[PDB]
Amino acid sequence: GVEHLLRIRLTNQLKSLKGLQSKLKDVVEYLDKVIHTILGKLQDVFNLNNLQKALTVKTNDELMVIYISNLVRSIIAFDDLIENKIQNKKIQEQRVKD
Amino acid sequence: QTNIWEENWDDVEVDDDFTNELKAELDRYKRENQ
Amino acid sequence: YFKLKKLEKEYELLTLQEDYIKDEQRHLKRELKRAQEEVKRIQSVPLVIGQFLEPIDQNTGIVSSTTGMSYVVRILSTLDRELLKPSMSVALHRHSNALVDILPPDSDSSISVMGENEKPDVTYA
Amino acid sequence: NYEVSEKAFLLTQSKVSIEQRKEAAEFVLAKIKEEEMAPYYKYLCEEYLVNNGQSDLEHDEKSDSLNEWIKFDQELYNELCKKNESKIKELNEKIQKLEEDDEGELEQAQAWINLGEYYAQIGDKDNAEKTLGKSLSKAISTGAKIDVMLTIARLGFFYNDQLYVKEKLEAVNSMIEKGGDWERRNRYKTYYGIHCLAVRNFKEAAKLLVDSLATFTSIELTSYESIATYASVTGLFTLERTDLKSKVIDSPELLSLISTTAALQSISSLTISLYASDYASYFPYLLETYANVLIPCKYLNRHADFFVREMRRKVYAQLLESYKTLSLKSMASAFGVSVAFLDNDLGKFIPNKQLNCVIDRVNGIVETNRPDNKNAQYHLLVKQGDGLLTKLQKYGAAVR
Amino acid sequence: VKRLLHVAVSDSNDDVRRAAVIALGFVLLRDYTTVPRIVQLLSKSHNAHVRCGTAFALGIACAGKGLQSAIDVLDPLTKDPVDFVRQAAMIALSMILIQQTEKLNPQVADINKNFLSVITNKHQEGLAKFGACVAQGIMNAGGRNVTIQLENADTGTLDTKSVVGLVMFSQFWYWFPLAHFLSLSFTPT
Amino acid sequence: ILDKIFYGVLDQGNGWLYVYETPNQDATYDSALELVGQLNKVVDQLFEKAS
Amino acid sequence: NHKLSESDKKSKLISLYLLNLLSQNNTTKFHSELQYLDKHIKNLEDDSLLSYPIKLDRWLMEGSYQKAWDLLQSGSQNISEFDSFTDILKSAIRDEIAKNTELSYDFLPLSNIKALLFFNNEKETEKFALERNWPIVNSKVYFNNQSKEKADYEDEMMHEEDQKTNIIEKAMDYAISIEN
Amino acid sequence: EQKIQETELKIRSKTENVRRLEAQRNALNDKVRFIKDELRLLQEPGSYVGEVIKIVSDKKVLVKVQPEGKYIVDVAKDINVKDLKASQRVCLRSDSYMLHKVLENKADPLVSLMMVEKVPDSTYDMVGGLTKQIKEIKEVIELPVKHPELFESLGIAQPKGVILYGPPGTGKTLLARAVA
Amino acid sequence: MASTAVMMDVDSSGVNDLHHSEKKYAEEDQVQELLKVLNEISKTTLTLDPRYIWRSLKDLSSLRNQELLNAETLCFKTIEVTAEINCFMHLLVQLFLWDSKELEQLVEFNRKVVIPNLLCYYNLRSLNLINAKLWFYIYLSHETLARSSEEINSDNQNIILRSTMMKFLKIASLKHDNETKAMLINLILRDFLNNGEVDSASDFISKLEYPHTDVSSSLEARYFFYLSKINAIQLDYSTANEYIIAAIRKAPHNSKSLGFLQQSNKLHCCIQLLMGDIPELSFFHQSNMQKSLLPYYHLTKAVKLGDLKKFTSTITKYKQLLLKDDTYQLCVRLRSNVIKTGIRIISLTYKKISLRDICLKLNLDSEQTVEYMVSRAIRDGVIEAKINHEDGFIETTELLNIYDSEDPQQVFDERIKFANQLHDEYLVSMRYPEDKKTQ
C-alpha cells in the first residue's frame, strides 16, 4: 500500500548542518540560557578536523585502483551495441529485399 | 630492417661485449697488473 | 525579408516540436519506472515445485512438474541462457503455470532421499 | 634440413673462423650433393651473399667472399632437375595412380608427403606446401595434420622463418588440442619455443622450451643439444633463479648432456659460476659463453645484446644488485676491473628504467630505493583507451 | 501544452493524464496538424488511458477535418485490448469521419462494419458496441447530413457551444446521461 | 630467497651489505591490463565482423 | 618577393629588433619571427648581428650565459649601436641565473654569486639579492625560501581532490545518470 | 533583406534536437510497450507440450500428451497436416487442446541390448600393422561401402556381412568401428 | 565512351538533381564519392568537347570553353544551372594536372569562375561545392614560384586570395558557411608556413576549429597539422602533438599517408624530441625514411645520447632536409637538453655527486659554466638536484614519491573524460541507425 505512495548519495550529506546548526547555538543557548559539564564532555571529542596526515593521502592510493574499471565500466558499452546494432541495422537496412 | 625482432629500447648500442672482453682482459690484465 | 514571415515563422512550430517531446521524454522515462516496478512484482510464493527440462527459446521452455506434468511454459525474463540453467529445480507459477525461478537447493524427494553419513564413522584399514 | 639451415646460419654468420664459414657449407657442399638443395641453396647462396657469401658458380663469385663454398654448379641443377623430375615423375603417376586407383586417401596423401619432403630436401618452399594442402586435403587424420607441423616446421625453419608456420603451428595445433597427444604439444612447444624464439621466447616459450625436455627434438627440424642449448640459455638468461636453481641448477637432462657437447660448458654452467657469484670469472664466461653460444646459433646471434647486456645487467640486478650500497670502487675496483667503464654501462642502467640503483660517480657510491606501487598500474593505462581510440575512431569510422 | 504534457507526464492518476491528453486537442485545436505526430508518442504507450486520451483530442482536432493519416494512427488503438479504448477510438474516428466517407475514405466501410462487427460481436463489450453504435450514430447524426464544427473558418472563429458537448461528453462512462450535449457542434451541410 | 636478491651492496672500507623490503604494491591493472588488453582484440575482430 | 629594392642594415635593424625582441623577452614571437623570417638561415647565419640572438638564445634560453654574456660585451653591434639592451640584457640575464642560483643553491658565497653575476662589487649583487629579497649573512647569499610558496591566488582549484572528482563522480554519475 | 534570411538557419539548425528526441522516442518508447508487452503473457493458462501419436485426414492430430493420455485434436492453422509427424513435440493450446505450435520432436534410439550407437568413431591406424586385414576389410567393407557399384560394375553381390578370424583382443572393436 | 564519362556526370547530375531536390547529403558525399571516381574516365577529349554541347548553351559554359580551347562544336536556363556550376566544380576538378598543366590560365578562370555567378548566393545552398583547396590547390602548384616575380606587387593575388578567402571568411557566416573555411586558414597557415608568423593563428584560433562535424577529418586533421606547427614555435609541444595526437590515423589517409602523413609524422617525431622523450622509432624506422624519419632517428640517435657534436653533425648533414622541412629551427634547443638529460642519469643517482664529478661530466664538457650549466639545468627542473659551491657538492634529490596523489587520478579524469568517450558517442551513433529506421 505504501508502494502506492511516493510516485544513491546526496541526502547523506544533507544533514551536514543539522546538529551543527543548533549545536553551537545550543551552547550559546545554555551559554546565555544560564547567562552543564556534559557540554565540556562533548568538547574533548571535538579534537576528535585538522587531523589530516599523509595517512589521508593514502586515500588516493586506494582511489587509484578504484578507477581501474572506469573504462571497463563502459568498455563493454565501448564495444558491443552499435557494432551489433549496425550489424542488426546492416541486417535490417540490407533486409529490404522486395 | 627485417620485420619483427624484439624491437624497442632501442637498438641499444654496439661494440660492447668484445669491448668488455677487451677490457675484461684489460680489466683482469689491469687486475693482472693488480 | 519577405517570404520568411510567411515561411520562417512556421518554424516556431518546429521549435515547439522539440518542446513537445523532451516533456513526453521524461514521461516514458517515469512511465518506465513505476511500471518497471510491477513487471518485476508479478512474482509470488505459494508455488508448485518442478524441474526444468530445456528451453524452447528465450522466454520459452519445457519443465517438469513434480505432479508429472511437463509443459511449454514461460519463464523469468530474469534468466536467459546464461543465468537460465540446463535443468533446474524450479519455482512454478500455478495456473499461469510458468517458471518463477530456479531453485539452488534440496535433495530428498522420491526417489527416497540420499544416504548421507557426513563424516562417516569408519577409518580405513 | 636441420644442419642445413644452421650450417647456413653458421656460415651466414661467419666472423670468427673460416671454419665458422668453412665447416658448415663443407657439409652443405656435400649436402647439396646429398640432397638437391639448390633452389633455396640458390637463395641461400643469395642469403649470405653480399657479405662473404659472394662466391657462387651461379649467383656471384667475389674475392671479398671469404666463403667460396656458397658456390654451385649447373650440374647441381641437372642433378637436381633429374632428381627433381625423378622424384616428381615417380610421385606424379604414383599420386596419379593413387588418384587412378582411388588408392587410399592418406595413402594418396602418402606420396604427397613424399612429394612434400623433397621440397625440403630440394629447398622448395613450394609444391610441398600445395602438396601439404593436397596432403591435408587427403587427411582424415590429425596424424596427417601432424604432418602439417612436420611440413610447416620444415617449411619455416628450413629458412628459420617466422609466423605463418607458427600461425600454421597455431593453426595445426589449435585444430586438435590432442597436441599430438603429449608429443606434438612438445613439437608445438618446441618450434613455438623457436618461432617465438624469433627473436624472443624470452620469458615466454623458453619456459616451454625448458619445460619439455627431453621429450622430443626432431632430427631434421632440430637436434637434442640444440633444444637443451637454446632452452637453457634463454630460460636461464630469463627465467626465475628459483626455477633455474630448481631446474637448471641441474636436471638429469643437463646431467646427461653436461659437457657432452662441451659446447655449452658455460650457458648455465659458467652461469652457475655466475650463479656462483664470482666477480670476474663469469664476466669472462660471458663472452666465453657468447661467442661460443650466441654467435654460433640461429636466434642466439640475432637477439645478442638482449642477453649481453641483460645478463651483464643480470649480474648487476640480482648478483651484484644495485648495489643498495658499498662504494662503487669496492665493486668497480676491488673487482679488478675498469672503474669508470664498468660504471658507465652500469650507470647506463640508471635510466634503463630497471635500476633501483642510486649511483654516484665522484664518491663512486651506489644506493637503492623501494619501487612503490608503480609497477604497472596506470602507466600502460594509456595504451588501451587509445587502443579503443583506435576503435573509438574506427567505430566512428564504421557509421557509413 | 508543455505544462499539460508534463502534467500528464507527471501525474499518477491516468484519467487526469487521459483528460490532460484530451484537453490538449483544445489548446491544440487550431493545429490538428501535428496532433497525430503529437499523439504519435502517446499513441504508443504502456497505458490505456494515455492511449485512451489520445483518441479524443486528435479525434476532436480533426473532427471537422481530414487526415486519415491521423485516423489510421488510431486504428491500432481501435484494437487496443481494452474495449473502452477502442470504444473511444471508435468514437474519435467517427467524430472525424462524418461526411468523409465512401472511397473518399474507403476505410469508413470497415470502421462502420467494425462497429457492426463489434455490434455483431457478443465478445465485444457494451463498452465496445456502445461507442460503435454511437460512433455509427455519430456519423449518422442529423440524418448523417450534418457536420461538426468549431473555430470555423466559415466564420474563421470559435464557438464555445461547439466545444461544450465534447467536454460534456468527456466524462460519460463516468456520468452517462451526458453526451446529448454533443448535439451542439452538429452543423448543416 | 625473497626470492631473491643477493643482495645489497658490499663495502671494502667497511665490510657489509645493505637491505630493503619486499611488499611492493597489489596486482591490479596487472590483472586489468590483460582484460583491456584482451577486450579490444576480439572486439576489433568484432568490428571486423560488422565491417 | 622584395628584390625590387633591398638593403643591408635591414639585416642590422631586424638584428637589432630581434635582439630587441630578445631583450623584449618574448620567446615564441622572437623565434616565430625567425619563422616569420622569409629566408632564414640564408639570411640568419650570414649576419653576426642576426647570429647574436639565437646563439645567444642557445646560451640564453637554457641559462648558461657565459660566452653569450661575454659575447655581448664584445659584440660589434653592442660595440656599434646595440649597447641599448646589452645593459638591460645583462641584468635581464642575471635575474634568471639569480633564480637558477636560487634554484641551484640555498646558501651561496657572496663571491660566487658575484662571480656568477659577473659583478665587481658584491654590494652590486647585495642590492639584487636584497632587491630579490634574499636572506643573507656575511659573505654568503642564502636562500631559506627559494620560492614564493603559498602566496594568495592559485587556490580553490587543486586541491580539487574530491570536489573536482566528486563533480567528476557527479559527472561520471551523470555520465551514468544523463546516460538516461 | 538577408535580415530574416539566415533566421532559418537558427531553427534550420534546430532540425537536430528534434531528431535526438526522435532518437529518444524509439530509445524510450520501444522499452515502454516492450516492458509493458510482457504484462499480458504473464497471464496465461499454460502451454501443453504434446506427443503426437499421428494425424488423419481429419486434420485433427492424434496425440498422447506426455503426462496425459491420447487425444485426437485439431492443429494450429499455421501448420500442415503433412508437415506433421507422430511423437511431435508441439505447443498444444492448453485448454483448446489444439496445436498451439510445433516444437522440436525428440528422437531416437532405444535399448534392450539391441541399441544403436550411430556411426561410431575410431581410425584404423590405431591398431595399425593389421592393415593387410584392414585392406582386406576395406576391400570387403569400405570399397563395397565407399563404391559398391565397382562390384556392381563387376556385377556381383558384394559382401553384406563380414568375418574376421584370428588373434583376439586388440581393441577388435576398433577394427570394426574405425572402418565403420 | 565520352558518353560513359558523361553518363557518370549524368548520373552525378542525376544526383545533382538529388541536390536540386534538397541537400545533398548524398549529392555532396556522392560528389565526394564521385570526386573519387573523377580519376577514372577523365580526359577532356570529347569529355570537355561535348561538355560544351552537353552544357549548351550557357554563357559561362561558353566562358569555360575558353578553358576548353579546342575543337568541339557539334550540337546537342534551369537544368543547366548548378550542373554547370557542378561542372564548374568539375572545371576545377578537370584541372588537377588532370586535364591541365598550367592552371594560371585557370587561375584567372578560377576567379572568372569563382567570382562570376559564383561566390555569391550559395550560403546554405552550395554546400562546400566550393573546394577552396581545389581553388587554391591550383595556386598551390603556382606557388612553386619563384617565377611569378610576385608579381604583381607582392604577391597581391595570394594576398587578395587571403582576402578572397577572407571574402569567404566574410561569407563564412557560420550558417554552415564552414567546411572549406580553415583550409583558407590552412592556406594562410601554410602561407605563414611559407614566409609568415602564424600568430594571427591565435586570431584564427580566436574564431574556430573548422566547426565542426561535416568537415572531412582530413582537413580537420590537416587543421591540427598546421595547428600543431603553430604550437611548434609557439613552443607548446603536447598540444601540438595533441594535435598530431588529434591528427594522424584519424583522417584515414593511406594514399595521403605516403607523402603527406610523413610530413605529419616528421613533425610528430620532433615533438617528443622537444619533450626529450624519443619514442621507439623501431616502427618509425619503416614507412618513414626512406624519405622522412631517419634524420629524426639520427636526431633520436643523437638525442638518445645528445652528443652536441655528433648531434650537430646530424643537422650538419641533414640541415638541408631539415631546411627542406623547416625543422632546422628545432633541435638546437634539444642539444644540451639531452646533455642535461644525460646529466640526470650521470648518477644524479647518488643523492649528490660532489661538484667536480658532476663537474667532471662537464669537466668532460666545460668548467664553471658548470655553475651555469647546472643552474642552466636546475633552472627548468628537468632534473631535481641541489648544490652549493660553498660546499662544492652537487646534491641530487630523491626524485622519490610514494605517490598516493591525484597524479594518477588526473590520468583517470583523462580516462574519465573517456568514460563517456564512445559511451556517449554511442548515443551519438544511436540516432543514425534508429532514426533512419523512422524514415
UniProtKB/Swiss-Prot annotation, chain D:
Localization: Nucleus
TPR-type repeats, residues: 109-142
Further remark: Present with 51900 molecules/cell in log phase SD medium.
Alphabetized SMART domains for the sequence: PINT
Quaternary state and interactors: The 26S proteasome is composed of a core protease, known as the 20S proteasome, capped at one or both ends by the 19S regulatory complex (RC). The RC is composed of at least 18 different subunits in two subcomplexes, the base and the lid, which form the portions proximal and distal to the 20S proteolytic core, respectively. Component of the lid subcomplex of the 19S RC.
GO biological process, one term: ubiquitin-dependent protein catabolic process
Name the UniProt record assigns to this protein: 26S proteasome regulatory subunit RPN7
Keywords: Nucleus, Phosphoprotein, Proteasome, TPR repeat
Function (record text): Component of the 19S cap proteasome complex which acts as a regulatory subunit of the 26S proteasome, involved in the ATP-dependent degradation of ubiquitinated proteins.
Record has Nucleus as a keyword: yes
Gene symbol of the encoding locus: RPN7
TM helices/strands, residue ranges: none
Any one Gene Ontology cellular component term annotated for this protein: proteasome regulatory particle
Domain PCI span(s) in chain numbering: 201-373
A family per Pfam: RPN7
InterPro entries, A to Z: PCI_dom, Rpn7/CSN1, Rpn7_N, RPN7_PSMD6_C, TPR-like_helical_dom_sf, TPR_rpt, WH_DNA-bd_sf
GO molecular function: structural molecule activity
Entry-annotated residues carrying Phosphoserine: S55
Chief location of this protein within or outside the cell: nucleus
Swiss-Prot record, chain E:
Residue spans of the PC repeats: 19-51, 53-87, 88-125, 131-167
PTM section of the record: N-acetylated by NAT1.
Homology family: Belongs to the proteasome subunit S1 family.
Miscellaneous: Present with 4750 molecules/cell in log phase SD medium.
Quaternary data: Interacts with UBR1.
Function, as annotated: Acts as a regulatory subunit of the 26S proteasome which is involved in the ATP-dependent degradation of ubiquitinated proteins.
Protein name: 26S proteasome regulatory subunit RPN2
Organism: Saccharomyces cerevisiae (strain ATCC 204508 / S288c) (Baker's yeast)
Curated annotation (Swiss-Prot), chain G:
GO cellular component, one term: proteasome complex
Key words, A-Z: Proteasome
Keyword Cytoplasm: no
Record-annotated PCI domain positions: 1-159
The keyword Thylakoid is annotated on this UniProt entry: no
Membrane-traversing stretches: none
GO biological process assignments: proteasome-mediated ubiquitin-dependent protein catabolic process; ubiquitin-dependent protein catabolic process
Origin: domain of life: Eukaryota
Other notes: Present with 9890 molecules/cell in log phase SD medium.
Functional summary from the UniProt entry: Acts as a regulatory subunit of the 26S proteasome which is involved in the ATP-dependent degradation of ubiquitinated proteins. Necessary for activation of the CDC28 kinase.
Record-stated family: Belongs to the proteasome subunit S14 family.
Record-given protein name: 26S proteasome regulatory subunit RPN12
Organism: Saccharomyces cerevisiae (strain ATCC 204508 / S288c)
Shown chain mapped onto the complete sequence: 93 to 272 of 274
Swiss-Prot record, chain I:
Pfam families from the UniProt entry: PCI, Rpn3_C
GO annotation terms (biological process): proteasome-mediated ubiquitin-dependent protein catabolic process; regulation of protein catabolic process; ubiquitin-dependent protein catabolic process
PCI domain mapped to chain residues: 221-401
InterPro entries, per database record: 26S_Psome_reg_C, CSN3, PCI_dom, WH_DNA-bd_sf
Post-translational modification: N-acetylated by NAT1.
N-acetylalanine modifications at: A2
Modified residues (Phosphoserine): S405
Keywords: Acetylation, Phosphoprotein, Proteasome
Keyword DNA repair: no
Gene Ontology MF term list: enzyme regulator activity
GO cellular component terms listed in the entry, alphabetical order: proteasome complex; proteasome regulatory particle, lid subcomplex
Domain of life according to the entry: Eukaryota
Comment field (misc): Present with 16700 molecules/cell in log phase SD medium.
Assembly with partners or alone: The 26S proteasome is composed of a core protease, known as the 20S proteasome, capped at one or both ends by the 19S regulatory complex (RC). The RC is composed of at least 18 different subunits in two subcomplexes, the base and the lid, which form the portions proximal and distal to the 20S proteolytic core, respectively.
Similarity comment text for this entry: Belongs to the proteasome subunit S3 family.
Record function comment: Acts as a regulatory subunit of the 26S proteasome which is involved in the ATP-dependent degradation of ubiquitinated proteins.
Name of this chain's protein: 26S proteasome regulatory subunit RPN3
Organism: Saccharomyces cerevisiae (strain ATCC 204508 / S288c)
